[PDB]
Amino acid sequence: LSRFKQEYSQAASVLVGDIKTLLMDSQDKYFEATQTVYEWCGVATQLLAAY
Amino acid sequence: ALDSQLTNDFSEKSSYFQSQVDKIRKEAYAGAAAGVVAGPFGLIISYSIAA
Numbered sequence A: 001l002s003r004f005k006q007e008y009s010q011a012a013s014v015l016v017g018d019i020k021t022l023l024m025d026s027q028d029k030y031f032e033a034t035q036t037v038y039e040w041c042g043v044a045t046q047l048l049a050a051y
Numbered sequence B: 001a002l003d004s005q006l007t008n009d010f011s012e013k014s015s016y017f018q019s020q021v022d023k024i025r026k027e028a029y030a031g032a033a034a035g036v037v038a039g040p041f042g043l044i045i046s047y048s049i050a051a
């Protein structure tokens, strides 16, 4: 029953960790996405305004 | 992951410690106690040797 506590610690640990990686992965991809937009959405307004 | 586990795993050794030092008493006193065969002065010698 020590093994029990062990084996599962193992699993949860590595999974919970992967989950973080995944979460952090997303965040960056979100940043990119939004940022990319904010950049164009920005040059654009100036141009429409000019037009 | 590492931290998650090293934390869980550490409490598991702290449990193994006391559970183990116990094994040590139980082994040693079951040994001294075994001096009942030879004289009680034998216990003094035995138990001093042990405890």
Ligand code: EMC
Binding pocket: A040, A041, A042, A044, A045, A046, A048
């Ligand atoms: C100039 C529309 Hg994001």
